[PDB]
Design a protein around this nucleic acid. Sequence first.
RNA 1: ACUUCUCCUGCACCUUAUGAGAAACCAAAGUCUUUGGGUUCUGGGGGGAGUAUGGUCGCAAGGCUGAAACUUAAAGGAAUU
RNA 2: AGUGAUUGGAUGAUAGGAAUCCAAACCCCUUUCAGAGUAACAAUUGGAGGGCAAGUCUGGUGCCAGCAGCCGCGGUAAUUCCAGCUCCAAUAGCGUAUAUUAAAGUUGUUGCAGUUAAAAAGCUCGUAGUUGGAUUUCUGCUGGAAGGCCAAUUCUAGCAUCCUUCUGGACUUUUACUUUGAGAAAAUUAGAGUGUUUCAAGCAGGCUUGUCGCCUUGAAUACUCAGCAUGGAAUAAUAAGA
Lengths: 178, 135, 50, 225, 38, 80
Amino acid sequence: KSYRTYSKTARSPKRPFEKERLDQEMKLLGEYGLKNKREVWRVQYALAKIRSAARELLTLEEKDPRRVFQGTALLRRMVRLGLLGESEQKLDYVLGLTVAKFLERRLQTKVFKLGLAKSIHHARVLIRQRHIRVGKHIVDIPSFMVRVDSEKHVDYAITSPFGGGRPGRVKRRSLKGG
Amino acid sequence: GKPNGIRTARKLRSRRRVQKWADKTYKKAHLGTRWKANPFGGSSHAKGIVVEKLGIEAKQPNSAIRKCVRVQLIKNGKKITAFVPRDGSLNYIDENDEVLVAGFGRSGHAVGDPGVRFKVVKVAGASLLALFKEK
Amino acid sequence: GKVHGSLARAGKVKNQTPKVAKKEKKKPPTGRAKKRQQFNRRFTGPNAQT
Amino acid sequence: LKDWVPITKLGRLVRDGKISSIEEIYLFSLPIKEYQIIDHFFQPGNCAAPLKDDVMKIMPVQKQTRAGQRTRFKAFVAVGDSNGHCGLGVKCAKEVATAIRGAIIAAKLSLVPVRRGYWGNKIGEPHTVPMKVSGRCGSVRVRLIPAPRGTHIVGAPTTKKILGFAGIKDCFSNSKGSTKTRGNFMKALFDALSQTYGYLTPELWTPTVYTKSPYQEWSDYLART
Amino acid sequence: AHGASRYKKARAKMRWKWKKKRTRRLQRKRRKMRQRSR
Amino acid sequence: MQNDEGRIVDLYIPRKCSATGRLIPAKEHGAVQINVGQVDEHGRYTGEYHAVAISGAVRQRGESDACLNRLMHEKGLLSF
RNA sequence: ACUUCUCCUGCACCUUAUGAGAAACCAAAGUCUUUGGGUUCUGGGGGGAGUAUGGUCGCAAGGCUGAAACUUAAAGGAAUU
RNA sequence: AGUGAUUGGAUGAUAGGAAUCCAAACCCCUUUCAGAGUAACAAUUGGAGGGCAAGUCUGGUGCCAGCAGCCGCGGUAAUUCCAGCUCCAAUAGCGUAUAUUAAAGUUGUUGCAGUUAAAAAGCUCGUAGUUGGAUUUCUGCUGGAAGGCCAAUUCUAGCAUCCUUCUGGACUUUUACUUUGAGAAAAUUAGAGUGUUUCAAGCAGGCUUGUCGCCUUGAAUACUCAGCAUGGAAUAAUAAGA
């Protein structure tokens, strides 16, 4: 009845059990500090939208007015998102993307890359416990993905102990208790 | 071989609809006999009453007595034999006790060790797994 | 199959076997913390009995 | 291990270090009869990269004779260094490890170069089967098709390995016939990759240079024992 | 049906010529019995 | 087989059979390469030659020699 | 009438294939994943069954057309020891 | 770099306020007094012979009970049953049943098969149906407008004997075919733009001590056999034969 669209962000692979596949996915969990195999398949699916878009465009012709429009819009996203570097703007380059390029751009890594978090796991806990101001307002969610002008901007939230606020609750219990 | 020519739509189209019926799986779908056949009504599950407790023996090589139940579907009062999964549980059934029946998972046909296509999912609504587990 | 196979022995081995309780042990980690442990112990068969 | 005594003209030349690399041998189409020739080119560290061997399958074979049955083991082994070099070899023997030794030797002896292409635009090292190439072996048709970059390899797990050992990054596999018989399937995939150089494009319409053979230019060494 | 194979006899069997005849006698009988009940 | 700007990618180029103009692969062990030596006036002489190559596809027909006549009629030194 | 030689049109035969096939074998079973010259008929695991019922031809014997319930993990092909 | 309950100090689940929301309650978002040390605030669901990732472990049972989608385990040493321990897979989800789609080049237009595996009517005639040989203004030079790129590629006028009734349409047998164009509701679908905190979404927003606020604000665009229209030299039907 209600006019609300909805979609599925991921889908499971055809083979359940392959030692080639399970090993290479487990590295991506171990590097970037992920909860479960759905978080990989999300990005697996998200790439294949962008990849199948370029695969459709690249078959045609460089002077065709569909490709010059829809290509330049797609390349703007990859430059904005910090996914493809700006030195190469060819549509061909989008194909040479991998899942490691997307997973380095999410906020788990860009905290750690920043280095405030120290360790991949710690960085996820800092995000979820209401620290880390991205731009103007604070962000609670690991799978954010940063737009490259915004990346310098990540900093501890004004509120909170790292930030310069009330020291949570447990430090007060020690301080008032003593 | 085939007719390739541009105006040969009828011969191509007619040959499929005729020779689709040569498939075994196509006939089980598309004939009218699906609705009369089965004790189920083209349905996933069906309740019934356990008229009798029964025992049947698996065909060689395997030998044993498998412990199944004869049931009458409420809608059609059609008798069927439903296997009881797991150790024991025969005690649990009680003659005249309503039992849910589910497909054996082979689309009728037969399972493993004779002529039984159904499994009793629940007894009195309790379900078999809860009791065997005892949870 | 023959109908007159007897139903006396039903629930032999469930009733036969010796009962034994589960041991109390410290809980495993779950979710992300589980996948941390599985990552490390492989890269620094998996079940090898004596 | 170990200093083998080369036998034949090719064996003598390689140990000395006169023939530079295996593309010179493949040009004039000369049969490499010892595996010690091909062991020389793929040196550890130096090879870039060393040849890699994986055992595809082990199958017990039995012959019913007189009283009792005799069983031998047939070992399929593919071997390759990523970067266009691949091979495929089989041997049977009474023990398992003795089969795999000789299977790896046979795999190295049947080592075949694989040309590789681009699918449309052509920048930055080739990554694909350069056209639609079929191979057959014993009621197993296999068809390798170029895919865009990053496509990866689409095919059976067996398919991924021995295209992997070639260095082909991207593919679309089809496979008619009984792919259950892995002995025929590997040979079908292998004889597809063997035909890549054999296929004539408009890139290779220019008439050939005709250099001297390695048998020609090092004749005076092969005079003396 | 059977068509061409009809008599393949790949493995120990009754023999087709005999089988066809046996079924004919069963069938012929079916007729008079069905005409008797008219 | 080029890419971007120059750089003939791939390793080596298969010889093309003279009789058919079809490429000779790596594992065709029935392939041939003949050298036929030239002569000076009142020769004598060798070392300058016409090279010529032909595949095992052509040879197993029996059509090696009939094509090899044609390939050294046009050079000069036969008169068929 | 016979000898030598060429032409079409017949029934075949021998030899061989980087042509094909699962193989046996095949101048067609070749030119088919490098897949499209034109067209007719037939088949879709093995039984049940060329049975049942209905139709139609037949003086009959039977012919042509022709199901289902239930049943079953193999039937079948070519070569090897 | 991993382990080791060896101690060690550093956010919301919850319960109640505040304001906000709401027609009136309520939830979200804010901020608040309490609020975790086996973090007892305790993650389960299916498996561990093969296919299928993961134990020739240890007890009990002895073709029994039972497992088992298929192949197969059990007849007194069970890598499959019933348990324990350990490990694997997915994870706030996971298993089962029925129908359906891919896998199925196992319905095959693209694209199968028919000597022996399933299958060429015993053989000729034959009406629709399907499919039908070659052949009828081709070549050349001189412009013109564009045109990508450090002259090619388009389109177009002439001249080799090329209409005219007028001042754009009439004639060129007729269609199919192809091209461009009309008209065809949105939602859904692809898709332009935009940090709903991310995201599924949504169609909003964004600048700024300025006040007739501004961005003469955005919410693009595609898609929708038969029918109507049109440029065109091939191909194929079809017509004919002053």
